[PDB]
Symmetry: C2
Subunit: 288 residues, 2 copies
């Protein structure tokens, strides 16, 4: 261990776990905002959607199917990290609440996606292929592997891993969410899009929380280190969206995608308290 | 480590964390029942209650105040254990869902109680005394200490600790819940009782889940070991309810209390698959 004695969030010292003397109001209120957005997979009517899945072009189906599987697996990764690391490391109560609520929510997202997949792909053969994306889908490896390094990185700091998970939930998902909102614009798959609105909003909040934790950190990574972790993730997201699973497939412009990722990165950088990196405008009218 | 390779729930092997191929339907459905009972402290109108607190005899207030504080602290203990042990140890997904939902719920119970306390005890001086029951209230030490041993008991098995936590949530809370339902019968403190109905129902479910996990265990403690852990807890509960914080205080018969604890213990024993221990009838008409 380092200088954890110096970190308020980490100093192995609440000597607490009695919840009402509320010390951190900014953290609390985030939990409250979480708690208030609760929802269940059950609240999403997937009943029309099979028709739509039907009236879709193949390319549109390959795309979607792959994204669903990419999200299915990623949520899994997110949760594991929270479970075995974040929620263990952080000592401040308010933060424990938020992370415990986030885990419950990841599980619900995991279920929603599973349902989408099961509802669209009647062929259990496929089903499996997709459930096992980490071991099947190369298009999801890098990303999965990048994120997995951080869980196993036992030499690095919380400040570093917090930034990384914020890149995972906010950068690794950005393109995909955006692609889904694209479909909505085009009037397709209501169930897929309606859920997407819920999920994306949860993830946003999960990103804001991470930036807040970052703020409560004393010893954080140097601004160069942060740029590099962000940058690395941006690149990886761009590649997935234009090469591995090109947005062309649902009629999107790969170039504007690439630029939105960057816009997304710069917003995060600002939330973390740094200058922007790329200085690009948001290209999607609808993502505003 | 033992023979974890042999335990389905523990064998460090889901090689999973992809949630939809559902293996354990009994576990799943418990999670679903949990998920469906969600509620927030906010849903409880504590608005009339100050009057009641008023129209109460002192003895009734001492009692209640102490119980609230005892519950406030215990919930804290429950959660810590889940957080740092149960949810880490158990590998089966369905179980991870249930435990992650349980933690979110403990946190909400922790908040409800805090609120009760804050709503009844205007004197922040007191407030504190109660928030710090573990270090102040001797009437809550033994119990707290008994439960804490299990979190730190690093030589004992999951089978043993699961039984113990089931004794904590089901035995250590039984009397108290019962005392609160007694007040309801007598028409007093609606807010305290209404919440109590919610909480008690959650705890019940948390007990049933533990019995289910016990069932999925291969290598469990010998029936004598289980009797002894249960027995130990029964005794301790009886003592708290008749000596430390006597139910006389709210006009209850200490003798019938003692017998209900035992009735409560035997029900748990049966749920765990063993014979009853005490063979007493349930003495409370209203707890039926
Ligand atoms: Fe998430
Ligand atoms: Fe509980």
């Amino acid at each position: 261990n380092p200088s954890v004695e110096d970190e308020p969030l980490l100093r192995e010292n609440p000597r607490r776990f009695v919840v009402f003397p509320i010390e951190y109001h900014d953290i609390w209120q985030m939990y409250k905002k979480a708690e208030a957005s609760f929802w269940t997979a059950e609240e999403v009517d997937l009943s029309k959607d099979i028709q739509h899945w039907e009236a879709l072009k193949p390319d549109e189906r390959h795309f979607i199917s792959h994204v669903l599987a990419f999200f299915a697996a990623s949520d899994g990764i997110v949760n594991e990290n929270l479970v075995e690391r974040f929620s263990q490391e952080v000592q401040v109560t308010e933060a424990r609440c938020f992370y415990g609520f986030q885990i419950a929510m990841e599980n619900i997202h995991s279920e929603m996606y599973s349902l989408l997949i099961d509802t669209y792909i009647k062929d259990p053969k496929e089903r499996e292929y997709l459930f096992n994306a980490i071991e099947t889908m190369p298009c999801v490896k890098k990303k999965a592997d990048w994120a997995l390094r951080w869980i196993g990185d036992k030499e690095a700091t919380y400040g570093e891993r917090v930034v990384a998970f914020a890149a995972v939930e906010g950068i690794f998902f950005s393109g995909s969410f955006a692609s889904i909102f694209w479909l909505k614009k085009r009037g397709l798959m209501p169930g897929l899009t309606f859920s997407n609105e819920l999920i994306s909003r949860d993830e946003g909040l999960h990103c804001d929380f991470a930036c807040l934790m970052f703020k409560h950190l004393v010893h954080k990574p140097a601004e160069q280190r942060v740029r590099e972790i962000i940058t690395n993730a941006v690149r990886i997201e761009q590649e997935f969206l234009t090469e591995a699973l090109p947005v062309k497939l649902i009629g999107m412009n790969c170039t504007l995608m690439k630029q939105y990722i960057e816009f997304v990165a710069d917003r995060l950088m600002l939330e973390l308290g740094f200058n922007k990196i790329f200085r690009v405008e948001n290209p999607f009218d609808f993502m505003e």
